[PDB]
Design a protein around this ligand. Structure first.
Ligand SMILES: O=C(O)CCc1ccc2c(ccc3cc(C(=O)N4CCN[C@@H](C(=O)O)[C@H]4C(=O)O)ccc32)c1
Lengths: 276, 279
């Protein structure tokens, strides 16, 4: 019962920090006084041990305690959430955390992983542990109505928007033929990671960043030169990822339901997600 | 035959709306045939089946699922109960129909929870819900976990807020916020309509209820004076889902089709058609 857990750097759901000189994680409490539960997570810096904590790490710990299993956490090697791509042709393969789950490098994905049809054809998602959607992040001062703005629908090299490569947003814009004009712009500017994109907005190198509202709203509450706009437009949700043969599928989902019902998710949401 | 599915639902507008047959003995417009066992009186199990016509948000989902998953169906309305409770260690309502194998699946405003999930398998949610709060436009409240609700005596004047008793919401508040529950009993409402009158007439400061239901009511409130909190503050988020028999061979295809509709924009088109209001 030693499960291989794969995750990804994505605040506030997963924080990644160096270990101390002795190879342990610095003890730390939140602003509200609760102990910060940190686990050792190996990943790229060759592979080195690092410290992981956050919403999703609290969730992992609750799940491993309820169903009573041990675990080891590592960061996805390519740093991506995961889409399906053709090889070279004929054969297709997933990348990112999706690829590591389906290949056996990981037994469970605990991350802000979006539930969609493309992925659900190959893996079992749990019930949502976080409901959210897509929104747009812009520098404070940039004015756009949302996803139907003309500067988004009739793009050009003057107003640049993008999302993260090999992600659910990339899928969402690539699968719908009616979103072909938008995707053709974004594929010229998509970023390797959400952190780079958000920094590029602050640097005025990117003008709009399309990403998960649970992440973008967090960022807006921290860096007050950034704002979201338009409200939601693709109400999705994050779920645990498992292979279809997993013997844990049932209890993971029951455990998530109970944790919504007893206020445990309310505790994590208030600790990691909500700010002002 | 393995392709003709028995499917149960429950009248609950706007998710399921029941009308009568055409004055051409058939169901027309955007309605599908659905039967109902109509009791002879209130002190008997004797009854008769009656042809009806059903439509609504959930029915349009069922039409979408039928063309995509490629199954035919025979739709009928639940009579022994509503959505489903474990009464005398026996499940009634829509949950009962599925557990005791009278129905392959249940389509309606059925909330996914842990308790029901131990006897049925739910699909992925097609609509978010949870415990939400509705106030008059102008009232500053975050959500259920606001201190003005947990510790109402700490503020002057204290908030006056309540729910409808003997529902899921009251049960959840009783187990999570014991003092809030005790305080709310002197403000509980007979039903949704009496709550909304209480909010508008100034007798009540906040009404705590099902999230999807409050959004539907706020969207069509006369004068747009009643508003709900932001979705990010809904407590105990969950969804409405389709209940299937545990181990059902249909759950996978139902899920793939539902997730397609969310991605297709079809689900948004139905939301706009049936649930989105003028406000
Ligand atoms: O304007 C109009 O005509 C209609 C106005 C109007 C009022 C009240 C309602 C609805 C619709 C649905 C509903 C469902 C429950 C209801 O029992 N639960 C919530 C869904 N889920 C139910 C369940 O799964 O058991 C239950 C619950 O979870 O508690 C209560 C009231 C209404 C519409």
């Amino acid at each position: 019962t030693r499960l291989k857990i794969v995750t990804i750097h994505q605040e506030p759901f997963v924080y990644v920090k160096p270990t101390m000189s002795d190879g342990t994680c610095k003890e730390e409490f939140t602003v509200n006084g609760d102990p910060v539960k940190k686990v050792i997570c190996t990943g790229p810096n060759h592979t080195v041990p690092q410290c992981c904590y956050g919403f999703c790490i609290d969730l992992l710990i609750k799940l491993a305690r309820t169903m009573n299993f041990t675990y080891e956490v590592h960061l996805v090697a390519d740093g991506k959430f995961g889409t399906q791509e053709r090889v070279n042709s004929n054969k297709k393969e997933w990348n990112g955390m999706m690829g590591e789950l389906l290949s056996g490098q990981a037994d469970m994905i605990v991350a802000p992983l979006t539930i969609n049809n493309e992925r659900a054809q190959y893996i079992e998602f749990s019930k949502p542990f976080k409901y959210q959607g897509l929104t747009i992040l812009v520098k404070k001062g940039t004015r756009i109505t949302g996803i139907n703005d003309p500067r988004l629908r009739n793009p050009s090299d003057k107003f640049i928007y993008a999302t993260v490569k090999q992600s659910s947003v990339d899928i969402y814009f690539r699968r719908q033929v009616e979103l072909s004009t938008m995707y053709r712009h974004m594929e010229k500017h998509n970023y390797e990671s959400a952190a780079e994109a958000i920094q590029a907005v602050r640097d005025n190198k990117l003008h709009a960043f399309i990403w998960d509202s649970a992440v973008l709203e967090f960022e807006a509450s921290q860096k007050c030169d950034l704002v979201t706009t338009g409200e939601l437009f693709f109400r999705s949700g994050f779920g645990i990822g498992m292979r279809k043969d997993s013997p844990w599928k049932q209890n993971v989902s029951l455990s998530i339901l109970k944790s919504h019902e007893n206020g445990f998710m309310e505790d994590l949401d208030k600790t990691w997600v909500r700010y002002q | 035959d393995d392709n003709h599915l028995s499917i149960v639902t429950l009248e609950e507008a706007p998710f399921v709306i029941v009308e009568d047959i055409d004055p051409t003995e058939t169901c027309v417009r955007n309605t599908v045939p659905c039967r109902k066992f109509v009791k002879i009186n209130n002190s008997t199990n004797e009854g008769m089946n009656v042809k009806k016509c059903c439509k609504g948000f959930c029915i349009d989902i069922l039409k979408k699922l039928s063309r995509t998953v490629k199954f035919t169906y025979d739709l009928y309305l639940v009579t022994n109960g509503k959505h489903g409770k474990k009464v005398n260690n026996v499940w009634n309502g829509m949950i009962g129909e599925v557990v005791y194998q009278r129905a392959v699946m249940a389509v309606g405003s059925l909330t996914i929870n842990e308790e029901r999930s131990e006897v049925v398998d739910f699909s992925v949610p097609f609509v978010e819900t949870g415990i939400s709060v509705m106030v008059s436009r102008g009232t500053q409240v975050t959500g259920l976990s606001d201190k003005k609700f947990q510790r109402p005596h700490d503020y002057s004047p204290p908030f006056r807020f309540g729910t409808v008793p003997n529902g899921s919401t009251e049960r959840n508040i009783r187990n999570n916020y014991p003092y809030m529950h005790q305080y709310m009993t002197r403000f509980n409402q007979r039903g949704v309509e009496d709550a909304l009158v209480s909010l508008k007439t100034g007798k009540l400061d906040a009404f705590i209820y099902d999230a999807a239901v409050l959004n539907y009511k706020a969207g069509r409130d006369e004068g747009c004076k009643l508003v709900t909190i932001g979705s990010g503050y809904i407590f105990a988020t969950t969804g409405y889902g389709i209940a299937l028999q545990k181990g059902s061979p249909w759950k996978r295809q139902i899920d793939l089709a539902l997730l397609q509709f969310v991605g297709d924009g079809e689900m948004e088109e139905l939301e706009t058609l049936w649930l989105t209001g003028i406000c």
